[PDB]
Design a protein around this ligand. Sequence first.
Ligand SMILES: CC(=O)Nc1ccc(-c2csc(N)n2)cc1
Ligand SMILES: CC(=O)Nc1ccc(-c2csc(N)n2)cc1
Length: 171
Amino acid sequence: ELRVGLEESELWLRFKELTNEMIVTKNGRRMFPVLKVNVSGLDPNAMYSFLLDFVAADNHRWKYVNGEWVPGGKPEPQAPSCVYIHPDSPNFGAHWMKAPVSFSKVKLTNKLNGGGQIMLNSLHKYEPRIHIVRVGDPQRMITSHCFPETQFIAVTAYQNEEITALKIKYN
Ligand SMILES: CC(=O)Nc1ccc(-c2csc(N)n2)cc1
Ligand SMILES: CC(=O)Nc1ccc(-c2csc(N)n2)cc1
């Protein structure tokens, strides 16, 4: 059976317990932690591409008030449907399964200025999602998984000083 397991789940949950935050900038910022997954149950002989996108979690934005995240108003129109293609794509099942698949180079941005970045709305919550697309398939088979441990709020600057400190501690 296909299994796509979050790596460093305990590390992600340390961030989630605080409410995780990811910086978005004009030129784009790499994530910490990095999204990494282990894969079993692909056809080792088949070819697949791995995609990453971010699902909007709420019908509202968030705000950090008196050290707490609370509902912060009506949402901005949904960020454009941006997909990040893992640079090892396309590749054999055996490639994806031999070692964890890391999305170390994806950049999160608040400005459409190219460079395969992902645009997110500041103060909105997102859940990372990985897609596995089968190559050369007339049915264009795709399998999608979200990682609830990896939910975060996009921010232009860290709100929670405990997040600032955790980013420094573990990175
Ligand atoms: C930019 C873009 O085209 N994104 C995208 C579109 C469709 C899907 C999809 C369709 S059926 C399934 N499980 N996922 C995933 C990602
Ligand atoms: C059955 C089906 O809906 N297949 C599907 C959907 C979306 C994608 C996709 C979105 S962005 C990208 N590079 N590939 C691939 C395959």
